[PDB]
Amino acid sequence: GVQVETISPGDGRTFPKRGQTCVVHYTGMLEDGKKFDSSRDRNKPFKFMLGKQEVIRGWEEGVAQMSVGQRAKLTISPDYAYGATGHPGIIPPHATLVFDVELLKLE
Ligand SMILES: [N+]
């Protein structure tokens, strides 16, 4: 599933609801610490609508447990990420992924 560990607290009150647009900054790494993607390197927050399956399941479920302003580390099993096939050339088969995610605002 997805394990959410707080790095820095949010407001503890405003949680994302289905249909809302989450604006986040994130860094994705493989289990060994190798970074594969990051909005921070592009200096542009990423937006996605909760509930439209525009992102991996681990995000849909993990970000929903975060409050606005919170920074958290999400550890995601392959079944909630890219599964057995992964994404050849980027994400290996059966990969557990770790994400450093900061929820900036909801639109
Ligand atoms: N996949």
Side-chain angles (χ1 to χ4, degrees):
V2 52
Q3 187 198 359
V4 188
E5 298 175 56
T6 312
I7 284 169
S8 189
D11 73 351
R13 310 167 167 234
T14 316
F15 295 83
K17 298 313 168 186
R18 301 288 124 159
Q20 289 196 293
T21 286
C22 297
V23 183
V24 306
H25 247 322
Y26 72 91
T27 294
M29 299 151 276
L30 302 175
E31 212 174 24
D32 55 52
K34 192 189 189 303
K35 180 202 296 181
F36 67 85
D37 194 22
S38 182
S39 57
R40 275 169 207 285
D41 300 336
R42 301 172 304 220
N43 183 50
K44 186 58 178 186
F46 177 74
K47 303 195 179 184
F48 71 92
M49 186 170 302
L50 192 65
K52 304 302 165 294
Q53 295 161 66
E54 307 188 321
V55 291
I56 54 180
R57 186 163 168 178
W59 270 45
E60 283 273 341
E61 282 183 26
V63 175
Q65 302 176 51
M66 295 175 68
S67 59
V68 178
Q70 186 180 350
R71 177 163 189 158
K73 170 172 276 57
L74 300 178
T75 297
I76 308 172
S77 53
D79 56 308
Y80 271 51
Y82 297 89
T85 59
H87 187 110
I90 304 181
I91 298 154
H94 308 277
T96 283
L97 310 182
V98 183
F99 286 87
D100 178 329
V101 179
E102 185 174 355
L103 179 54
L104 302 167
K105 55 177 293 189
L106 293 170
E107 288 177 346

